[PDB]
Write a protein that binds this ligand. Structure first.
Ligand SMILES: [Mg+2]
Ligand SMILES: [Mg+2]
Ligand SMILES: [Mg+2]
Ligand SMILES: [Mg+2]
Ligand SMILES: [Mg+2]
Ligand SMILES: [Mg+2]
Ligand SMILES: [Mg+2]
Ligand SMILES: [Mg+2]
Ligand SMILES: [Mg+2]
Ligand SMILES: [Mg+2]
Ligand SMILES: [Mg+2]
Ligand SMILES: [Mg+2]
Ligand SMILES: [Mg+2]
Ligand SMILES: [Mg+2]
Ligand SMILES: [Mg+2]
Ligand SMILES: [Mg+2]
Ligand SMILES: [Mg+2]
Ligand SMILES: [Mg+2]
Ligand SMILES: [Mg+2]
Ligand SMILES: [Mg+2]
Ligand SMILES: [Mg+2]
Ligand SMILES: [Mg+2]
Ligand SMILES: [Mg+2]
Ligand SMILES: [Mg+2]
Ligand SMILES: [Mg+2]
Ligand SMILES: [Mg+2]
Ligand SMILES: [Mg+2]
Ligand SMILES: [Mg+2]
Ligand SMILES: [Mg+2]
Ligand SMILES: [Mg+2]
Ligand SMILES: [Mg+2]
Ligand SMILES: [Mg+2]
Ligand SMILES: [Mg+2]
Ligand SMILES: [Mg+2]
Ligand SMILES: [Mg+2]
Lengths: 63, 131, 394
RNA sequence: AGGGCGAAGCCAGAGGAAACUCUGGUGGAGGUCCGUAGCGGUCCUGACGUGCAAAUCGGUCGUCCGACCUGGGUAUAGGGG
RNA sequence: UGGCCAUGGAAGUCGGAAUCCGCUAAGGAGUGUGUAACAACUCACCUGCCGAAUCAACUAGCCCUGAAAAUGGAUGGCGCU
RNA sequence: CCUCUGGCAUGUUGGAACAAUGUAGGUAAGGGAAGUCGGCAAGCCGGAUCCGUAACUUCGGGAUAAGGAUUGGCUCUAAGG
RNA sequence: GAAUGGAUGAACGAGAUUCCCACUGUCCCUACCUACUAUCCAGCGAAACCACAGCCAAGGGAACGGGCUUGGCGGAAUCAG
RNA sequence: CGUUCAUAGCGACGUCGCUUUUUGAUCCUUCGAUGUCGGCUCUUCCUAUCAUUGUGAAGCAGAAUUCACCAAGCGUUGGAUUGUUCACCCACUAAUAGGGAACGUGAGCUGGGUUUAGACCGUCGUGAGACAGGUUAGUUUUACCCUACUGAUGAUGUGUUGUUGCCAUGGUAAUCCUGCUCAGUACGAGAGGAACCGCAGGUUCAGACAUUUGGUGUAUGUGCUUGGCUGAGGAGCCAAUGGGGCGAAGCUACCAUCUGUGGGAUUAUGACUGAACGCCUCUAAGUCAGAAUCCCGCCCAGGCGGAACGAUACGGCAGCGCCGC
RNA sequence: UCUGGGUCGGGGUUUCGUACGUAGCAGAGCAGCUCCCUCGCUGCGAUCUAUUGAAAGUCAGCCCUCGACACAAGGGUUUGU
């Protein structure tokens, strides 16, 4: 059961949950939930969005 | 040997999925779905991997104004795989095909869903990406 | 004239008076046929629908496309704390039917159980089986008791134990423990009866009834939905937009000339809270409850050989609208009848099970334990505490 | 109400040998267009249908400087108006 | 005895006019099968065994086939041999 | 659409529930008229500025044809007496 | 079929059709939500309709019975639909 | 006729019937009005069986098939044109069988068509006007009564009450298909080309359910934003839910997930032993196999039908249970 | 009196996406004053960073509390073998 990572937020996605997107360019994204997926489809740069992992890495939070 | 399992089928009769092979067709007006007994009032519906009759609505005039078989290759309606991952595809899409499953084109633009690949080998051979 | 275009009719007549069930606790309408040969056992149990969740498993049906492929799978947790046998009750065959013959109750009976016998316990003096239990300590009574048991040995054919739940051990509000007759199926009636006479006043856990990868029939009352219209209750076509006197209706009740409306015509009425016996629900996991040797053993529930963590089947923030499953539980495949908290009768199958699918051995790979009270993303609190780091509440 | 289109006339500039023509303005025509009040009354075959109402209600509509709308006064009366 | 007509082949045999004699114990110028046509097969007269009735064609009584409708159903009902 | 001046007590009643049917509003995955006599109903479109504008023509129109782009907040500049 | 007007025709049309693009719960196929109802209560309180009445099958019958014949059968008083 | 052969399949000249899903006859009923076509929606029946189960037939080698029997359990679809019924075409399918129920069904809808009044055209009429000739515009009322059905309280009984139970009677459900394998095998000159048992799935139907995906969302949850209004900030409110992101719970979708079972009697049929009829015969006495049938099972409801068991009014007035007389 | 259920609080869970305030050498530029210093100082200034995965809501039908607070044999009508 290869746990995958959400292509927007960064959280892990356990076998059951979330949804898999297959764009016609021929690359795929995993979304934890719809909240991620909506921001992805509306083109939100996840590094700008606080609660994502990509933001917190960028802003050096924790550590 | 191993059979298909049902998948949420979001192409009723009336769809114009885009032809994703090199024929010269652009669209594929699904006029009917193959292997549907069906019930009163109910539209025949083809998910991915489904055979389908398909008029071409725009493209080359060789193909226009007649019926061809076709296969659905991607679909925007999110189906569920047996491993509990839902999956959807950004576009509905198919390929013009002959009765015995061979393509009449030659190369498939875009990815094919593996539900379609495993079930259609000659499509699978011409598919670059799968799933 | 004939109806133009044929179509199969909506809903089954094999289910109707579509009325609100008299019972709440689902009756076992038939116990299995006691072959006299195999040893004695209980045929039924009484659990409670705590909640759903995932599983993950390797599947082994060769031929399938999914052979040796990890699928996920929904499951119900039926929290099943052990029942207490407080009675036996002999039956005898007649040409009229199957008359109850003699009921011997145990000596001591819990207030869990005694609750049941009064409509208002607060107001009662709790005087039930008071002159009864006098029998169990004298020469006269004990002798009459023995003669009753002897008579049952002479005459009776079917023997059912009476047990009841341990309402004490649950997260439910109610204290009034459900009794139920459960049938002892096994050897000769004299052997059969002395087994139940030994079990009297005693615990009986779930593993004594059921085993793993076993098809069982869930019996319960459906999640009730009140008055519902014909479109909900029968799934009749909606009529179109333009319909003047409404459109969630049936247009033609009936023909003119059987000049009555038939029982087969769809009408609005009670939708839900029906009695229903869904069969073939495979037990994936009989789960051991919390226990103490030095500290808690919470692990023994939702840990698998391949996971090895310290979970229980309880998700974060508990099973919603229920509690903590702190007791032993079964884990069936798929949904089952009824609501959260609903008392649920399990029953061993009526049917000689020998299908590839019904003998399949289930090795679970992973129990999802993420919260159900919103979109959960963490399996355990320790994982969450790791992922987040420190919070302002520290 | 408020907007749109911008007819004749007028100005300048440029061309034209003349005839006159182009370009930019100004000007504000019309049973002209949108659109309020007004007047009306298309569709929903909506609401209502022992009604609010012996013809009403709601949205949606037509028209809105003209064969426009409208008070009061005055004329025409029954095979007559 | 490839009888005669019929050749397209009918020597018994798609059909039709014929249609008798011999040997005879007895076999039709042939009931059919089948053949391109034969062949081959098959269908009287008589025995051997068995042991008293046997068999044909009509006819009329009851019974049965002929005999299929839509709400569930009516010798009045229950029933009846 | 919101406000002051002035004016009212929700249009012949109150309370408790939140079932089915409705009346009046909304929203819907994938498909997009396959519905239906018929796109009925609803939905799309909508303001402004800047481009761009066909057939046809009674040369006036068609024309907001179609088809495109932009639009907020903030801090400045330049241009008009 | 030619001012019982014929042929035409830009502009215009709450006029009659047909197709395409867009758009949509029209539909596949239904679902959830809101408000006012309906619901239960206090107060108030009508009407139409009414031979008697009100469970069926079959029969006959003015040739489709609630009532008749023969069968099935029949259990107070009520509530929402 | 069918090469040959009346009867595998057919069937002239003749003949005997049934049927009321055709149309006529007829005018018995209704003119102090029984709402007049079609479609939608829904239920039920019939069989004169298209498919599906079990079988006999062939001019049945296989495949494909027509003919017949038991048989109506389960099905019999999506569209283009037409107001249509009917018709035709495309597509799928296992099959796209046929009917009935006041030519089922308008206080169920719809109103496109017939069939008022407004108008146009053609033909007819001097004309008013006419036209199973065309066109367009044209109000579809009422249930609160009784029954029937749906669900909902209750009812008589059992001394009262509660319990756990039984079961009379009603209802009733599963369906058909593909793929793989058998197998390029039987069969066939070849071309072609099966089947039983397995295995994997799917259609339609049914019964649930919400872990997950999706839908809803006024938790009016939390941002964001328009116009206005509390002097401003902050905090808010109003705009019949101001608008919009995201959205818990809860409902909910072949738009997510799960489950759908076993016997008996036999029918058609093919057989046994076996007379009638010294043989022969499935039948006459006797016996066997036998099915989408039928009856039950499971499954739902549970009778003016029963059951075993519990407790049975301390009291301030009590009232009762047994026993014997 | 398995001392209980209830309100408030606290955790957990979860939804949204980082509150107010304060600080900043962040901030397109602009201004006032001057020490005309243009990193002068002081003010205006959308927004940005930090404090801060913060703030806020989270049963009303989510889960655990055994922390705080009261309140918990009370009332009315019944029925007999
Ligand atoms: Mg239809
Ligand atoms: Mg039919
Ligand atoms: Mg209407
Ligand atoms: Mg949840
Ligand atoms: Mg109307
Ligand atoms: Mg009304
Ligand atoms: Mg009023
Ligand atoms: Mg009001
Ligand atoms: Mg008031
Ligand atoms: Mg008033
Ligand atoms: Mg939609
Ligand atoms: Mg249609
Ligand atoms: Mg259509
Ligand atoms: Mg419209
Ligand atoms: Mg135009
Ligand atoms: Mg003329
Ligand atoms: Mg002339
Ligand atoms: Mg004329
Ligand atoms: Mg009458
Ligand atoms: Mg012949
Ligand atoms: Mg007639
Ligand atoms: Mg009538
Ligand atoms: Mg028949
Ligand atoms: Mg009719
Ligand atoms: Mg009617
Ligand atoms: Mg009507
Ligand atoms: Mg009309
Ligand atoms: Mg007219
Ligand atoms: Mg009422
Ligand atoms: Mg503010
Ligand atoms: Mg207002
Ligand atoms: Mg027989
Ligand atoms: Mg037998
Ligand atoms: Mg049998
Ligand atoms: Mg029964």
């Amino acid at each position: 059961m290869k746990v995958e990572l959400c292509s927007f937020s960064g959280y892990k996605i356990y076998p059951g949950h979330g949804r898999r997107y297959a764009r016609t360019d021929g690359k795929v994204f995993q979304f934890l939930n719809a909240k991620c997926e909506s921001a992805f489809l509306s083109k939100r740069n996840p590094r700008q969005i606080n609660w994502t992992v990509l933001y917190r890495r960028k802003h050096k939070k924790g550590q | 040997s191993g059979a298909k399992f049902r998948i949420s089928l979001g192409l009723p009769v009336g769809a114009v999925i885009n032809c994703a092979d090199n024929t010269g067709a652009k669209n594929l007006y699904i006029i009917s779905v193959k292997g549907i007994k069906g019930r009163l009032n109910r539209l025949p519906a083809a998910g991915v991997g489904d055979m389908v009759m398909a008029t071409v609505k725009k493209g080359k005039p060789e193909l226009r104004k007649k019926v061809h078989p076709a296969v659905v290759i991607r679909q925007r309606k999110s189906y569920r795989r047996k491993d509990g991952v839902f999956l959807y595809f950004e576009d509905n899409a198919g390929v013009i095909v002959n009765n015995k499953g061979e393509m009449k084109g030659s190369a498939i633009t875009g990815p094919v869903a593996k539900e379609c690949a495993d079930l259609w080998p000659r499509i699978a051979s011409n598919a670059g990406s799968i799933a | 004239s004939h109806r133009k275009f044929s179509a199969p009719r909506h809903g089954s007549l094999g289910f109707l008076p579509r009325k609100r069930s008299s019972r709440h606790r689902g009756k076992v309408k038939s116990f299995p046929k006691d072959d006299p040969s195999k040893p004695v056992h209980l045929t039924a149990f009484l659990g409670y629908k705590a909640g759903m969740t995932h599983i993950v498993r390797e599947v082994d049906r060769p031929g399938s496309k999914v052979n040796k492929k990890e699928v996920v799978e929904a499951v119900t947790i039926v929290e099943t704390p052990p029942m207490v046998v407080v009675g036996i009750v002999g039956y005898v065959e007649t040409p009229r039917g199957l008359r109850t013959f003699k009921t011997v109750f145990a000596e001591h009976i819990s207030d869990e159980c005694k609750r049941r016998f009064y409509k208002n316990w607060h107001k009662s003096k709790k005087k039930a089986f008071t002159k009864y239990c006098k029998k169990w300590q004298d020469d006269a009574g004990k002798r009459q008791l023995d003669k009753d048991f002897s008579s049952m040995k002479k005459y009776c054919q079917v023997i059912r134990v009476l047990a009841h739940t341990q309402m004490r051990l649950l997260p439910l509000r109610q204290k009034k423990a459900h009794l139920m007759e459960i049938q002892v199926n096994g050897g000769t009636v004299a052997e059969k009866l002395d087994w139940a006479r030994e079990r009297l006043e005693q615990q009986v856990p779930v593993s004594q009834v059921f085993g793993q990868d076993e098809m069982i029939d869930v019996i319960g009352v459906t999640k009730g939905k009140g008055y519902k219209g014909v479109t909900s209750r029968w799934h009749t076509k909606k009529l179109p937009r333009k319909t003047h006197r409404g459109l969630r209706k049936v247009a033609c009740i009936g023909a003119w000339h059987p000049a009555r409306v038939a029982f087969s015509v769809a009408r609005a009425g009670q939708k839900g809270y029906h009695h229903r016996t869904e069969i073939n629900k495979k037990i994936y996991k009989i789960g051991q409850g919390y226990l103490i040797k030095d500290g808690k053993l919470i692990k023994n529930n939702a840990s698998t050989d391949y996971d090895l963590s310290d979970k229980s089947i309880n998700p974060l923030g508990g099973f919603v609208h229920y509690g903590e499953v702190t007791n032993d539980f079964v884990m069936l495949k798929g949904c089952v009848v009824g609501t959260k908290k609903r008392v649920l009768t399990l029953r061993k199958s009526l049917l000689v099970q020998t299908k590839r699918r019904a003998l399949e051995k289930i090795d679970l790979k992973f129990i999802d334990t993420t919260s159900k009270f919103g979109h959960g993303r963490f399996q355990t609190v320790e994982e969450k505490k790791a992922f987040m780091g420190p919070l302002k509440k520290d």
